[PDB]
Amino acid sequence: PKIENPLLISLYSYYVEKTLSETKSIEEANQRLRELGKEIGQQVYLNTEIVEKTKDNVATREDVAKLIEIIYKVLFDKKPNDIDMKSARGSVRITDDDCVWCQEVNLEGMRGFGYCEVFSGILEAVLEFKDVDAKVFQEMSKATGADSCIWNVRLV
Amino acid sequence: PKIENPLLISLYSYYVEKTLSETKSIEEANQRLRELGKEIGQQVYLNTEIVEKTKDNVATREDVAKLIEIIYKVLFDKKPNDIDMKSARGSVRITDDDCVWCQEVNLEGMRGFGYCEVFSGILEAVLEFKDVDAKVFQEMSKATGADSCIWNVRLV
Ligand SMILES: [Zn+2]
Ligand SMILES: [Zn+2]
């Protein structure tokens, strides 16, 4: 049962349980984890190579895709398993088969809960630095029984 | 200024700032960080090699020192810069010149605040799993301008 980055996932699991206990609904929990991601995305953008490797003018869905690839290589030393520009019209969908956030997590009866919504917030924060108004949510999470984690980035 | 594990560092930084805003004294903030550490410590003991690589019967000061070395190897893939059972008789002092928690943090003021007290709690929790009663506190932190981070493990 090998775990990568045990400190990070233990701290995140703590935040997830705290969030679930301090909110009234699954949707409120999703939004609170997104807010957490937006708050830590500020430091993650400025304190890492992301602010140096990304360009100032992010205009198109293809530019957003490139920006996502830069985030992934800087934070996780890999590419996303898929970036899908066509299935959700007006969106960019990102797939990760080995998400760091939910390793070995198994929640039942919580299919509406985006366990890894912190990453939705981190992407919204980075796009906001580029003055790209975006809405990001998690479509699927291995934590709730899916085969991969998938986030949906809508430029809106 | 390159940072190791930027997601962990930023998430922890969020926790510290929220803790400082919610507590009524620096020592209360210190205690909240140690309590977070104890919770993290439970997860890192159950979900890493620490439990499989450490002795079951920890009886001497020398045994506690070797346990600390194993924690450091598993969590950080390094040894502490110093483990001191000399300067503080009855306690064990751990020195880390490149602490993960406070990379690039430079607080102003905050005398008495241990930015990295989360690791005091992790240590206290692991020792507790080994039936070793300890109180752990941070002597100094690079976040408040020291050149090193030092934690003091007091036995009994
Ligand atoms: Zn995930
Ligand atoms: Zn430190």
Numbering used by the authors:
A (entry chain A), B (entry chain B): 2 to 157
Per the authors:
Here, we take a structural approach to assess the relatedness of these eukaryotic-like proteins in Asgard archaea, the closest known prokaryotic relatives to eukaryotes. Asgard archaea roadblock, longin and TRAPPC3 domain-containing proteins form dimers similar to those found in the eukaryotic TRAPP and Ragulator complexes. Here, we adopted an X-ray crystallography approach to compare the structures of a potential Asgard Rab small GTPase, several RBs and two TRAPPC3 proteins to their eukaryotic counterparts, with a focus on Thor and MKD1. We conclude that the emergence of these protein architectures predated eukaryogenesis, however further adaptations occurred in proto-eukaryotes to allow these proteins to regulate distinct internal membranes.
